[PDB]
């Protein structure tokens, strides 16, 4: 099980053996040294990633369609109604995800990271790594969107188009040199 590392000549932690997808020997802050936490962290990493992937497409695509910018949506949409209705809808779904099924004791023991919602039988220890890596990329992206929202105060497609039109007058250097 050869695997690459996140920084050239480092040595991986001893609890990261490559046994799991998208392991690149990266845990300097030692947050997965205990195995049971490493189990939950693994579920959390895939779930934050999946949500960032949905989020970043959700943030970009309506702005491409001219339906508005993602961080200005709350002057046309009421947040509190949206969030009430969303939590009503989401709650039994999240419940069942954490529960492992519909039963009170779990019963119908399902994988809460990788359930079988796959009609194309595409699941391998490789596609798992691709899902993780795409997710990590999207999480970094959604971090970018939020910081860019605050610093430049324009949307992300606008930010891209500005960089393409004026690469020297629209970059992190120029935008942070000024008061912002």
**Which residues lie closer than 8 Å to 171 by C-beta, 6 or more apart?**
163
Q: Min. distance of Cβ 161 from ligand CLA in angstroms?
A: 24
Q: Which does 164 bind (CB under 5 to 8 A by kind): ligand CLA, another protein, none?
A: another protein
Q: Which residue in this structure is represented by tokens 């932690």?
A: 13
The nearer residue to another protein, 2 or 80, going by C-beta atoms, is 2
Q: How far apart are CA 11 and CA 174, in angstroms?
A: 38
Residues recorded for the chain:
180
Report the chain's C-alpha Rg in angstroms.
20
Using the rule CB under 6 A, is 129 a contact of ligand CLA?
no
Site string for ligand CLA, 1-40 (x = CB under 6 A): ---xxxxx---------------x---------------x
Annotate 70-122 with DSSP letters as a single string: GGGGGGTS-HHHHHHHHHHHHHHHHHHHHHTSSBTTB-S---SSS-S--TT--
Using the rule CB under 6 A, is 91 a contact of ligand CLA?
yes
Q: Min. distance of Cβ 3 from another protein in angstroms?
A: 9
Contacts of ligand CLA in 41-60 (CB under 6 A)? 43-44, 47-48, 51
Helices (H) and strands (E) in the chain, counts: 5, 0
| Residues 175/57/51/49 CA torsion (nearest 10 deg) | -70
Using the rule CB under 8 A, is 120 a contact of another protein?
yes
Give the range of 26-34, 59-67, 102-110, 117-125 binding another protein by CB under 8 A.
Answer: 117-125
Which one of 98, 119, 167, 173 is in contact with ligand CLA (CB under 6 A)? 98
DSSP state of 166: -
Footprint on this chain of another protein (rule: CB under 8 A): 1-2, 120, 122, 124, 126, 164-165
Footprint on this chain of ligand CLA (rule: CB under 6 A): 4-8, 24, 40, 43-44, 47-48, 51, 87, 90-91, 94-95, 97-98, 136
């Amino acid at each position: 099980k050869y695997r690459g590392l996140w920084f050239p000549n480092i040595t991986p932690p001893a609890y990261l053996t490559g046994e799991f997808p998208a392991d690149r020997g990266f845990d300097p802050a030692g947050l997965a040294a205990d195995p049971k936490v490493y189990e939950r962290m693994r579920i959390a990493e895939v779930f934050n990633g999946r949500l960032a992937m949905l989020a970043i497409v959700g943030c970009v695509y309506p702005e491409l369609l001219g339906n508005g910018v993602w961080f200005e949506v709350w002057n046309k949409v009421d947040f509190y109604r949206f969030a009430l209705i969303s939590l009503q809808v989401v709650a039994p779904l999240e419940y069942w995800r954490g529960n492992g099924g519909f039963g009170w004791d779990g019963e119908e023991k399902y994988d809460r990271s990788y359930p079988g919602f796959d009609p194309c039988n595409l699941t391998t220890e490789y596609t798992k790594a691709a899902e993780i890596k795409n997710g990590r990329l999207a999480m970094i992206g959604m971090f970018g969107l939020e910081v860019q929202s605050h610093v430049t105060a324009q949307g992300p497609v606008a930010n891209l188009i500005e960089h393409l039109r004026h690469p020297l007058a629209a970059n992190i250097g120029a935008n942070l040199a000024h008061p912002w």
